[PDB]
Amino acid sequence: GMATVILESIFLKRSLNFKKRLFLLTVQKLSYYEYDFERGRRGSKKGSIDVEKITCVETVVPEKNPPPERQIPEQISIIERFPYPFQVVYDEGPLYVFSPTEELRKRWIHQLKNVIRYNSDLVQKYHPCFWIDGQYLCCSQTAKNAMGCQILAAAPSTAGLGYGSWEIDPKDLTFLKELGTGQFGVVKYGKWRGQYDVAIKMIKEGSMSEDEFIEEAKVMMNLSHEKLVQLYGVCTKQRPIFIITEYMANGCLLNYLREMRHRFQTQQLLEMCKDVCEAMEYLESKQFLHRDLAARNCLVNDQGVVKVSDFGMTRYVLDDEYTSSTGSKFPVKWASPEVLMYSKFSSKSDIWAFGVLMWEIYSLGKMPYERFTNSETAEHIAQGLRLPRPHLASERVYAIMYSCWHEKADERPTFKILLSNILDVMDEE
Ligand SMILES: Cc1c(NC(=O)c2ccc(C(C)(C)C)cc2)cccc1-c1cn(C)c(=O)c(Nc2ccc(C(=O)N3CCOCC3)cc2)n1
Ligand SMILES: [Ca+2]
Ligand SMILES: [Zn+2]
């Protein structure tokens, strides 16, 4: 996955002694340390739990008589008063943590519950109350590893798509239609447990760095936005492996644009841009690059909503004709000059590509730089060649896409700024 800290908070931890600890969560580990107040950083490490060993995270029933420091009834209190407990359940008994606020406890529980979907020894039951004086107060059982006495409200074993085990059973898939092929081979439409529509990407053996994708899915499983194609899970206990996603009935945006019968109004085209920009603002906020943003990599559902697809997947492509910046399959005509010249990938190369995508949308799927080959494009865009204003784009709309192609990456806007510009034009109309 990634070594990035997803959540950082100061909590009160129970050993019976209670101590303030800085908790840091990564997809790999939940670690806690003494808090270096003076330096505003972590102090000495005091322990850690491997995320793969966590079987359950849930609230705890509060103690009936907790001292003032833990009594339910801003700056000073949020680091001195900890009344809301939660438990992290793993092999070595539960770990009890007290949050200063309810919102913060909710945030940690929500995040941890999603993360542990990846794990293999998940439980359906837990202990609602504290283990104290050699027994659980809820059921009076005397073993710390005693099975939970109460079923979880949304136990993963019985949870629906997006909340269940990350590994999906392929025997629960029905295949109904061929959706064509892409960089990793065949894709199909089908049903999960006979009711839920899904897309099944079947990974051609030898096309993907599978072990890296499977591990790194720990990060991608946390990406969720209304305008991102949702990843539901994987099937990796067979050959080939499958990637299971949200199904988009209308296919890829590029082919959608090229279907002349739609006869889109320019308001509809701007809405497509807004959809994509919202997805990209979300990915930018998670410091996650797409690296092949283009109309061909966006999909359209049966409601006409555009969503961004296959973000982050370039990293696992084994084909050097795709990966090489001069390869026949590399997306040269969406690549910023710095990418082509120096392999300088950043949020700003995604911004460049977004501009070309806006141009595609207002050109109804025309090939960019049609008069030029990939090699010619690479040479001339580094000199200052730019895509001209599409006939359907107003000067104001063109200014947005044009801003994406500044020769200096740092003078390119962010997706937050682009979205603001798009919303302004929608109002102005
Ligand atoms: C994403 C995708 C690829 N492309 C890839 O898998 C791919 C892999 C890697 C990359 C990188 C280069 C970035 C690494 C890019 C793309 C190839 C084929 C289909 C789909 C796809 C997916 N989903 C989630 C749908 O809902 C859907 N829905 C469709 C719905 C309808 C139709 C359609 O109109 N059809 C089907 C066949 O022909 C008849 C009409 C087609 C697709 N189509
Ligand atoms: Ca269609
Ligand atoms: Zn119990």
Author numbering: 0 to 14, 23 to 80, 90 to 170, 384 to 658
What does the study report here?
Btk dysfunction is the cause of X-linked agammaglobulinemia, a severe disease of primary immunodeficiency. The Tec family kinases have a lipid-interaction module attached to the N terminus of a Src-like module (i.e., concatenation of an SH3 domain, an SH2 domain and a tyrosine kinase domain). The lipid-interaction module of the Tec kinases is an extended plekstrin homology (PH) domain fused to a Tec homology (TH) domain.
We expressed a ‘PH-TH-kinase’ construct of bovine Btk that contains the PH-TH module connected to the kinase domain by the 13-residue SH2-kinase linker. We replaced six residues in the activation loop of Btk with the corresponding ones in Itk, shown previously to stabilize the activation loop of the Btk kinase domain. The kinase domain is bound to the inhibitor CGI1746. The interface combines a set of hydrophobic contacts with a hydrogen-bond network. In particular, Tyr 134 at the C terminus of helix α2 of the PH-TH packs into a groove between Trp 395 at the linker-kinase junction and helix αC in the kinase N lobe.
